[PDB]
């Protein structure tokens, strides 16, 4: 099924030629273009008053990363290195070691936020929902080094955006 | 989102309603765009009879997508070689006549309108079921099962660390991309990584022909004959 | 259906492709060495390098082939072979609604007759093949680098060319000009050997030597 | 921030169509952002018997 | 309970138009010229 | 949050901090792991 | 060496050089180059600054991430100097000013500030302090710049014994205020050479040569306590040197002879400007004064470096000053001027 | 007279970088080839990988 | 193997055993392949690893608490197909897909056993035995490992 | 809690703290050394040891799908307690 | 007081600077598409005084949006050196920041920093058009805290 | 069996000058040809 | 096995012939190239750098190979003639910014484990 987009032949009767001539001299399609720009002038602009009116997002939004912890308080990451193994840009570096108490966690968990592609593959691979991408997207910085997060900064994010990340996965865990 | 074996996760509840709401008024917005340019004397003079290519010239130069459609060649992978469920949706391909910039721009606008019918059919015929192939060795298991059963955990572990080994072979698939015939010549070797992923660029052959279409036209028309080219510069350069 | 996950297989297309494969093989036995139809109904024609031009011309012009569109022209670098490069042609026939694959072989120092005469689309594809891999093509109009930066050394897509390259770039203030230096990665690319030591597909079990 | 009828008549006439029917701004017809939890289905192979992977 | 996923309404979504809706407005060719000439005649007088 | 406040846990901060970039409260990346090679400590005994 | 200071790599940006420099006043002519040379080898340079952070932006893209650290310091504050030099291996002094600011005269910035830097560095426990002073440093020269420099280097020597002292003759480079200063004198009618500049003898030294000289001094183990003197290979008479500048710049030459006392007056007239002064009386004395040869002090060559003649790197500075009529002229069109025996 | 379009000003080594990654890891690359055709690019790659795997996605 | 499980029951758990400061013993993961038992009684010569009890409750270990100590003790880590027996010194410090394996020759003893030194990020985690069929067969000494 | 170093710097839970003679410290001057205070090593200790009258238990960290994968701990050795590897919660048979 | 007079005068200049930033679009990759959405009426970059203007002789800030390929690296430096220089550089996306996805390629420089000095860094892949608006807002704050006149008065 | 202006090219293939490798990485590097041993864990 | 079809040259004699005028085409425009690109370096060090690059590729004793560098040098000449390479690309041949790597064994032993 195809349609011929431009195969219209104008009529040669005395009426049609005059209308085309009237269109030519008395610019009409130009007025129609003008007339519609006036229509948009009186309409309702769609601009949102940033930062007083932030844009609409979804619970699945991928932003700044953070390591969450169990309700008890102990971290969720058990250093399985799934997130590091599946990271498409190799932005994850992990070093683990037996903790003093037994059950062992990472001693180094660095995310290179200038090498990250924010694909979210880390939060899917994680079998304990430890590493997640938080809702924040306003962590722009003045220096390149401030982007290169390590375990401490990421753990701080987990203790800062927990009130929001907990609700997001609460609304989205059933889909996954 | 689109991944081998289906999609990542199902649609959030209430998304189809918003898609219907947006598509309802998009016909008007298309008329808003095309009314100020299609009949506009300035617009046609800036595009009509500019960048005209022939039929056999377009075929030989590797042109695909709109460029064949815009110059009489009735070709569209969505109809000739239907992939996915494109054999069930009905739509009209806007074959062009003159082949210049103006005809192709009209084909683009008509292809915009035709997608709405395809959107309408997809919204009204969306079936129930899963969103990934029910096979853990290719698509990762559900998170509920990964925390419950042995096999799901092992498959999730191996799939996100090593991946799914694919049979050793070479293939060349192509789809009617919104610019052309985007395709990949994927060569495997039986491992969990590709051996060679050549990426067919619809704009590569398109940009290769820019010299042919620019022959004789004034320099100020060079922007017009790359505008109808639709060369996104992450595909040609890859 | 009993195969809700397995991709359905078409035998009619397999028979039509196989019949055409024998047809092309008999037409030009001078270059066609072997021909095969893959499991997912795709035809590959293995020609001798000298037959690059004659075979393509036949597929382009014959009334029963009419393959009149070079989809892409690429090569696969396989160092373990005597002719490491393996030039691959992909053609599409609009009249007959089919695609064909024509593949040759070439070592490092051997020129291939440029297909610019038959398919003018090959012109830019030829430059990429030379730039990425180093395969020179004779009779090419404007054979030169297309993708790599000016004065680039080596051919990147070669398997023996390191991924990070040999040279990085930096703005040096002493000369007030962007300069080139030997590469020094802040973090080395952690290579991952993730090939399971257990056989995957018994169908492709290469017989022992 | 739905405007006065005087503007609506002028805005409609200037464009040549009824714009109040289909508008570019979503007021309330959008789906609520707090939706009830879903119940995803299962794949065809989610069977307790006669579901051997070799087949 | 039963399966619950995003689905179209039971009767399906309403129609979604796609064709061109360019209207025809303004007087015919002769009328535009007549009022243009008539203004000149009054202006001349 | 007035109608539905989020669940409360100990580790959650009690005072939100804005972008601390620029101000002398930034985040300075640093190694979170200890040393690897222990240098041999020479004997302070005057030997002989 | 500390466990974290052992050199590593191949001298590139990511290579660990092993020197923690503290280049003072790096937001300037030599400060730009010395940071760059330290930046290439991968040295954590603690650059203190008192100017606007924007004026230090050009310094940022010269080292790997985390290498170049910017700190705020004030000249008349021991605490600021201590803060910047507390963790350092080498401290480089480059504070200087060709004019006397309202809050800072030649005494303040060439003796007082170097005194505080040297004294605090010894208390901190740094290894090497590289202090820079003019080659023409003298206690009796009327130009307070040379007079202050001579007092400062003696004082720095007292406070820091094993402090290498550099005595460059006159740097020339992209922004040198030496070749640019003479080239900029076209606006003021003709060039008013003092006594036609037939007696002043100068030995300009390339800026890059000085920069690599400082870096070689850092790595050299014998630089402890020495007092180097950096001079160019050739030695030029003032009139012929200005001839080479204007010939390379292809500008008209008007050798105006002007009495010394009158020149001191016009230097006073240009001194009144609150902004960056075009020239001061002390500047007039300096260009009038010659560069005495000091063979006893070790030269530039002793720091494993070869000097670069001005006639080799002349178009670098004066290509900008050329108009469109001479913006594309070659390098060898103008031959070197008269070379008085060195 | 002639139009020589010098390209390569954004020659990111995508085709070489794909080799070193897994099939799932190479998925985001196709979203970053054409900045505007996102699902269309992934659809082509998904079809290619599914065709080699002899596996079809569910109707939904 | 299949791609799912149809086992809607409660799994079993087995108390851990201690056999020395060298061998990680998580006996819940064991599959009772008796590879460790066979190795101890054949290649090591000491008979302290065995199987106690019958049925699904059968557990492989040493009954009375006793360290399995021999110059070839660490080899039971390699033969064990699961993570039931692993190495305490290296325990959960790296992952197999991220280490680079470099062949070398052990120098601790005069046998000159061939080993595969695994290095990641310029560090040494594991010394795995290689195969030579003449010098060290498929084993190394504990002092080597 | 957090222990300060003799040089006057907070020590992270991993035990990281720069030496007095370490040059890589100037970064922290005029900035702050990011360290978390909720030391997970400590906080897990305050969790009471649950007592259940069964030889084995099943721990999933609570929340079902929101917790760690379900594991079964063998609370047979009366000498000590059984702790889940993923989360660290302890369990103990009350005098068996 | 002289310090007070220089204080108000500096604020007047800094207000005139931050209230008129004219980006010189270096649209390179998919990071540029999201930036145009900032120019789209949803966020309306123009409303903040910041409006897109070509001809780097008539622009104040660079917005590096996309990967920086080694072949074009001289072009980035040249168009940076030609700006009348109260000037700042905004890096959009992981690729422009430090290489991002193509950090390990043979022909992508690991960050736009190695060519030009970089002001505020905008992380993302791509950073959403709202995130860039926050970035430009951060530069306005940075311009607000400029003491150019105070430093001159205390030189 | 191919008359294509065939000439005697006895000398060994020396494509090194074309691969673009710098001088350092072409002599001082000692490559190793080996069949990798099985991961003893597996 | 010992015989393979050539690129352009049938033996070393004509291959050497194609090198000579390539060197000719490289000698003539060096002052023109220096003028065109505002080279800081004088003409003289331009000419021998062409000579030195031609000199380092001397051990080649294969007609097919010599053709490959001959055509590759032609593109390099083409890139330089029609201002396709800028100053930075030209200055790339003069390795200026990088420090001289010493060649004596003693210095290498002092700096690192480089063989
Ligand atoms: C020709 C212009 C004539 C004067 C303006 C008339 C006008 O447009 O009034 C608005 C009014 C409604 O406009 P609308 O866009 O339909 O309003 C939509 C919402 O109701 C809008 O909802 P809203 O809540 O945004 O409306 C509140 C709005 C309402 O604002 C007004 O009504 C402004 C105009 C009156 C003051 O007031 C404000 O927002 C407060 C700030 C006002 C800004 C400064 C206004 C300056 C006016 C001119 C001063 C002299 C020059 O216009 C009309 O009804 C038509 C007037 C036709 C006049 C023809 C004269 C010949
Ligand atoms: C109508 C406009 C009313 C307000 C105008 C205020 C003056 C603005 C002039 C431009 C900025 C420079 C200035 O004020 O002083 C120049 C002064 C000149 O002395 P300076 O030494 O501070 O200059 C900057 C630093 N160097 C020289 C290294 C580039 O500079 C500054 O104030 C900038 C700091
Ligand atoms: N021919 C020559 O000029 C020679 C010069 N030298 C010495 O080299 C040094 C640097 O010269 P050059 O780079 O050309 O000089 P510039 O004037 O170009 O730069 C001087 C540097 O010192 C800083 N500075 C100066 N005075 C003060 C002060 N009172 N408080 C804080 N910082 C201050 C400047 O900061 P800011 O930029 O903010 O003003 C800037 O960083 C000087 O000691 C000079 O005497 C040695 C031999 C020859
Ligand atoms: C202007 C700015 C950039 C400026 C810098 C520009 C630098 C690059 C310029 C282009 C260089 C070019 O690629 C070089 C090439 O192709 S090939 C070199 C010669 N190699 C051969 O020909 C192989 C065989 N060798 C011989 O034949 C003998 O060695 C000899 C040549 C001595 C003749 O011997 P006879 O006498 O026996
Ligand atoms: S989202 Fe970022 S950190 Fe996570 S896997 Fe993707 S690239 Fe890696
Ligand atoms: S995937 Fe989760 S549990 Fe595994 S290492 Fe990463 S953060 Fe830790
Ligand atoms: S070798 Fe391992 S799996 Fe086998 S019986 Fe011994 S402990 Fe169990
Ligand atoms: S990796 Fe193997 S041994 Fe370890 S838990 Fe998984 S199945 Fe058990
Ligand atoms: S950071 Fe991401 S979005 Fe931006 S240019 Fe790179 S790949 Fe594209
Ligand atoms: K094991
Ligand atoms: Zn638990």
């Amino acid at each position: 099924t195809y349609k011929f987009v431009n195969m219209r032949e104008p009529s040669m009767d005395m009426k049609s030629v005059t209308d085309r001539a009237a269109q030519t001299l008395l610019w009409t399609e130009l007025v129609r273009g003008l007339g519609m720009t006036l229509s948009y002038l009186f309409r309702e602009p769609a601009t949102i008053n940033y930062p007083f009116e932030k844009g609409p997002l979804s619970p699945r939004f991928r932003g700044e990363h953070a390591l969450r912890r169990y309700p008890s308080g102990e971290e969720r990451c058990i250093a399985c290195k799934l997130c590091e193994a599946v990271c498409p840009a190799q932005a994850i570096t992990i070093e683990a070691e037996p903790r003093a108490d037994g059950s062992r966690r990472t001693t180094r968990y660095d995310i290179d936020m200038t090498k990250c592609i924010y694909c979210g593959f880390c939060q899917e691979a994680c079998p304990v929902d430890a590493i997640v991408e938080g809702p924040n997207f306003e962590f722009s910085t003045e220096t390149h080094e401030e982007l290169l997060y390590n375990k401490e900064k990421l753990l701080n994010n987990g203790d800062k955006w927990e009130a929001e990340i907990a609700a997001n996965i609460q609304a989205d865990y059933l889909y996954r | 989102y689109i991944r081998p074996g289906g999609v990542h996760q199902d649609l959030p509840l209430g998304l189809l309603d918003d898609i219907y709401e947006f598509s309802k008024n998009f016909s008007f917005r298309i008329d808003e765009l095309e009314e100020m340019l299609t009949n506009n004397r300035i617009w046609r003079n800036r595009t009509v009879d500019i960048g005209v290519v022939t039929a056999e010239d377009a075929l030989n130069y590797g042109f695909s997508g709109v460029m064949l459609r815009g110059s009489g060649i009735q070709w569209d992978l969505r109809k000739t070689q239907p992939y996915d469920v494109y054999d069930q949706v009905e739509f009209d391909v806007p074959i062009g006549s003159r082949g210049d910039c103006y005809d192709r721009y009209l084909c683009r606008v008509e292809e915009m309108r035709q997608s709405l019918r395809i959107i309408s059919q997809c919204l009204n015929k969306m079936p129930p079921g899963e969103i990934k192939v029910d096979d853990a060795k290719v698509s990762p298991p559900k998170r509920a099962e990964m925390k419950t059963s042995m096999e799901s955990l092992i498959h999730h572990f191996k799939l996100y660390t090593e991946g799914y080994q694919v049979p050793p072979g070479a293939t060349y698939t192509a789809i009617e991309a919104p610019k052309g015939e985007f395709g990949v010549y994927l060569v495997s070797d039986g491992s969990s990584r590709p051996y060679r992923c050549k990426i067919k660029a619809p704009g590569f052959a398109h940009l290769a022909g820019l010299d042919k279409m620019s022959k004789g036209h004034m320099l100020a028309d060079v922007v017009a004959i790359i505008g109808t080219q639709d060369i996104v510069f992450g595909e040609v350069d890859r | 259906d009993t195969r809700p996950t397995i991709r359905p297989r078409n035998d009619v297309v397999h028979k039509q492709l196989s019949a055409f494969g024998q047809y092309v093989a008999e037409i030009l036995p001078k270059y066609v060495q072997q021909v095969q139809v893959s499991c997912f109904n795709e035809l590959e024609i293995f020609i001798h390098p000298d037959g690059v031009i004659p075979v393509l011309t036949f597929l382009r012009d014959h009334t029963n082939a009419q393959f009149k569109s070079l989809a892409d022209l690429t090569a696969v670098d396989v160092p373990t072979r005597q002719n490491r490069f393996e030039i691959v042609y992909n053609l599409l026939s609009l009249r007959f609604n089919s695609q064909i694959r024509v593949k040759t072989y070439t070592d490092e120092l051997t020129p291939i007759e440029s297909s610019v005469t038959v398919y003018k689309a090959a012109n830019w594809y030829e430059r990429e093949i030379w730039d990425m891999f180093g395969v020179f093509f004779a009779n090419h109009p404007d054979l030169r680098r297309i993708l790599t930066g000016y004065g680039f050394e080596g051919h990147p897509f070669r398997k023996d060319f390191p991924l990070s390259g040999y040279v990085e770039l930096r703005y040096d203030d002493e000369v007030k000009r962007v300069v080139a230096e030997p590469v020094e990665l802040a973090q080395e690319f952690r290579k991952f050997d993730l090939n399971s030591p257990w056989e995957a597909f018994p169908a492709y079990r290469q017989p022992p030597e | 921030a739905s405007a006065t009828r005087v503007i609506q008549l002028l805005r409609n006439w200037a464009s040549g169509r009824d714009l109040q029917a289909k508008l570019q701004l979503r007021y309330q017809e959008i789906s609520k952002r707090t939706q009830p939890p879903p119940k995803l289905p299962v794949g065809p192979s989610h069977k307790l018997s006669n579901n051997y992977y070799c087949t | 309970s039963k399966v619950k996923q995003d689905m179209p309404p039971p009767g399906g979504y309403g129609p979604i138009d796609y064709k061109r809706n360019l209207p025809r407005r303004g007087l015919s060719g002769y009328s535009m010229f007549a009022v243009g000439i008539g203004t000149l005649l009054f202006g001349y007088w | 949050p007035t109608t539905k406040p989020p669940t409360a846990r100990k580790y959650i901060w009690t005072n939100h901090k804005f972008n601390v970039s620029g101000t002398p409260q930034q985040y300075v990346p640093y190694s979170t792991t200890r040393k690897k090679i222990q240098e041999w400590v020479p004997p302070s005994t005057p030997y002989k | 060496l500390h466990h974290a200071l052992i050199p590593h790599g191949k001298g590139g940006r990511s290579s660990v050089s092993g020197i923690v420099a503290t280049v003072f006043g790096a937001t300037g002519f030599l400060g730009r180059y010395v940071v760059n040379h330290l930046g290439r080898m991968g040295s954590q340079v603690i650059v203190p600054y008192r100017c606007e952070p924007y004026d230090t932006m050009h310094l940022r893209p010269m080292g790997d991430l985390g290498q170049i650290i910017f700190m705020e310091w004030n000249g008349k504050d021991k605490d600021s100097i201590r803060k910047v030099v507390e963790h350092s291996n080498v401290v480089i002094n480059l504070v200087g000013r060709e004019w006397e600011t309202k809050n800072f005269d030649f005494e303040d910035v060439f003796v007082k500030i170097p005194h505080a830097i040297a004294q605090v560095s010894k208390e901190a426990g740094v290894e090497k302090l590289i202090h820079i002073s003019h080659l023409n440093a003298d206690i009796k020269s009327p130009s307070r710049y040379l007079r202050s420099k001579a007092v400062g280097e003696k004082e720095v020597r007292a406070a820091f014994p094993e402090a290498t002292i550099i005595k460059p003759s006159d740097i020339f480079g992209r922004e040198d205020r030496f070749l640019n200063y003479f080239a900029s004198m076209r606006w003021f009618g003709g060039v008013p050479l003092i006594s036609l500049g037939k007696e002043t003898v100068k030995q300009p030294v390339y800026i890059v040569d000085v920069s690599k000289g400082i870096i070689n001094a850092i790595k050299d183990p014998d630089a402890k306590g020495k007092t180097f003197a950096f001079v160019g290979p050739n030695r030029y008479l003032l009139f012929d040197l200005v001839q080479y500048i204007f010939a390379v710049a292809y500008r008209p030459f008007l050798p105006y002879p002007l009495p010394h006392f009158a020149y001191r007056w016009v230097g006073r007239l240009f001194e009144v400007s609150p902004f960056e002064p075009w020239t001061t009386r002390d500047k007039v004395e300096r260009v009038h004064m010659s560069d005495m040869t000091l063979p006893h002090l070790p030269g530039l060559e002793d720091l494993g470096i070869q000097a670069t003649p001005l006639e080799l790197k002349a178009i670098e500075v004066l290509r900008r000053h050329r108009t469109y009529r001479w913006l594309t002229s070659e390098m060898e069109d103008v031959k070197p001027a008269k070379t008085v025996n060195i | 007279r002639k139009c020589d379009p010098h390209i390569g000003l954004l020659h990111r080594g995508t085709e070489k970088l794909i080799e070193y990654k897994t099939y799932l890891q190479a998925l985001p690359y196709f979203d970053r080839l054409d900045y505007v055709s996102m699902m269309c690019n992934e659809q082509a790659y998904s079809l290619a990988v599914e065709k080699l795997l002899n596996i079809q996605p569910p109707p939904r | 193997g299949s791609d799912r499980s149809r086992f809607l029951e409660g799994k079993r758990a087995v108390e851990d055993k201690n056999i020395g400061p060298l061998v990680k013993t998580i006996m819940t993961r064991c599959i009772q392949c008796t590879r460790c038992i066979r190795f101890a009684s054949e290649i090591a010569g000491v008979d302290d690893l065995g199987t106690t009890g019958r049925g699904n409750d059968m557990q492989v270990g040493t009954y009375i608490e006793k360290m399995f100590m021999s110059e070839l003790s660490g080899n039971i880590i390699d033969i064990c197909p699961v993570g039931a027996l692993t190495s305490k010194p290296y325990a959960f410090t790296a992952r197999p897909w991220e280490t680079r394996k470099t062949e070398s020759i052990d120098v601790m003893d005069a046998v000159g056993s061939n080993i595969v030194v695994s290095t990641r990020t310029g560090e040494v985690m594991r010394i795995l035995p290689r195969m030579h069929e003449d010098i060290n067969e498929e084993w190394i000494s504990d002092k080597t490992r | 809690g957090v222990r300060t170093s003799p040089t006057g710097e907070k020590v992270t839970h991993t035990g990281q703290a720069y030496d007095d003679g370490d040059y890589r410290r100037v970064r922290f001057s005029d900035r702050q050394k990011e360290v978390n205070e909720n030391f997970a090593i400590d906080l897990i200790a305050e969790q009471p040891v649950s007592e259940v009258g069964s030889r084995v238990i099943s721990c999933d960290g609570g929340g079902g799908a929101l917790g760690h994968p379900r594991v079964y701990i063998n609370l047979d050795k009366e000498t000590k307690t059984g702790t889940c590897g993923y989360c660290g919660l302890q369990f103990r048979q009350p005098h068996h | 007081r002289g310090e007070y007079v220089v204080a108000k005068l500096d604020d007047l200049v800094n207000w005139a600077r931050r209230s008129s930033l004219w980006p010189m679009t270096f649209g390179l990759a998919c990071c540029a598409v999201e930036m145009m959405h900032m120019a789209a009426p949803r966020y309306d970059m123009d409303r903040f005084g910041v409006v897109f203007r070509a001809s780097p002789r008539q622009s104040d800030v660079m917005i590096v949006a996309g990967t920086l390929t080694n072949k074009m690296a001289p072009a980035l430096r040249k168009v940076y050196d030609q700006m009348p220089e109260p000037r700042y550089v905004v890096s959009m996306g992981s690729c422009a920041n430090g290489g991002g996805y193509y950090h390990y390629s043979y022909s992508v420089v690991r960050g736009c920093d190695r060519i030009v000095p970089v002001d505020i860094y905008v992380p993302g892949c791509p950073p959403t058009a709202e995130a860039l608006l926050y970035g430009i807002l951060q530069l306005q704050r940075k311009i607000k805290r400029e003491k150019r006149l105070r430093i001159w008065y205390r030189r | 069996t191919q008359d294509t202006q065939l000439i005697a090219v006895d000398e060994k293939l020396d494509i090194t000058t074309l691969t673009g490798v710098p001088e350092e990485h072409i002599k001082t590097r000692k490559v190793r040809i080996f069949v990798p041993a099985r991961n003893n864990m597996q | 096995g010992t015989s393979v079809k050539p690129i352009f040259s049938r033996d070393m004699n004509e291959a050497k012939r194609r090198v000579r005028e390539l060197y000719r085409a490289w000698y003539r425009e060096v002052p023109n190239t220096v003028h065109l690109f505002q080279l800081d370096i004088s003409v003289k060090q331009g000419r021998d750098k062409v000579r030195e690059m031609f000199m380092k590729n001397a051990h080649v004793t294969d007609p097919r190979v010599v053709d490959l560098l001959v055509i590759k040098g032609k593109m390099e000449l083409e890139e330089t003639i029609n201002v396709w390479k800028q100053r930075t690309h030209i200055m790339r041949f003069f390795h200026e910014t990088e420090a001289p790597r010493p060649t004596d064994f003693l210095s290498k032993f002092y700096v690192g484990h480089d063989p």
Side-chain angles (χ1 to χ4, degrees), chain G residues 97-153:
Chain G
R97 195 62 111 203
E98 319 217 58
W99 48 102
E100 307 211 311
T101 108
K102 46 281 203 183
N103 278 31
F104 287 100
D105 49 55
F106 289 169
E107 179 36 283
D108 307 339
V109 321
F110 299 121
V111 169
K112 217 142 290 191
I113 303 311
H115 175 25
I117 290 163
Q119 143 181 297
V120 170
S121 310
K122 181 47 77 84
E123 303 169 320
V126 307
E127 320 308 316
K128 322 197 199 35
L129 170 142
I130 275 62
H131 180 275
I132 191 168
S133 172
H134 209 291
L135 165 69
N136 304 334
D138 164 40
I139 319 91
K140 77 241 7 91
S141 300
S143 93
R144 315 218 311 138
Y145 183 22
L146 299 182
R147 153 149 62 259
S148 311
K149 287 291 233 175
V151 182
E153 55 174 42

Side-chain angles (χ1 to χ4, degrees), chain G residues 13 27 43 48 53 123 140 142 160 183 193 225 245 249 252 278 295 314 317 335:
Chain G
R13 290 170 104 273
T27 89
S43 15
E123 303 169 320
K140 77 241 7 91
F160 217 96
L193 285 328
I245 284 177
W278 306 110
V317 202
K335 171 288 162 283

Side-chain angles (χ1 to χ4, degrees), chain B residues 150 154, chain I residues 29 81-84:
Chain B
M150 197 21 63
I154 292 180
Chain I
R29 306 168 195 167
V82 283

Side-chain angles (χ1 to χ4, degrees), chain J residues 17-31:
Chain J
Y18 274 89
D19 176 297
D20 193 334
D22 213 324
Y23 94 88
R24 336 199 296 290
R25 179 124 55 71
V26 278
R27 46 181 78 191
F28 298 148
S29 39
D30 321 62
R31 337 268 179 70

Side-chain angles (χ1 to χ4, degrees), chain M residues 100-115:
Chain M
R101 152 41 37 61
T103 206
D104 59 292
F105 166 86
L106 192 59
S107 58
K108 267 173 273 326
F109 163 82
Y110 275 136
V111 295
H113 331 82
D114 289 307

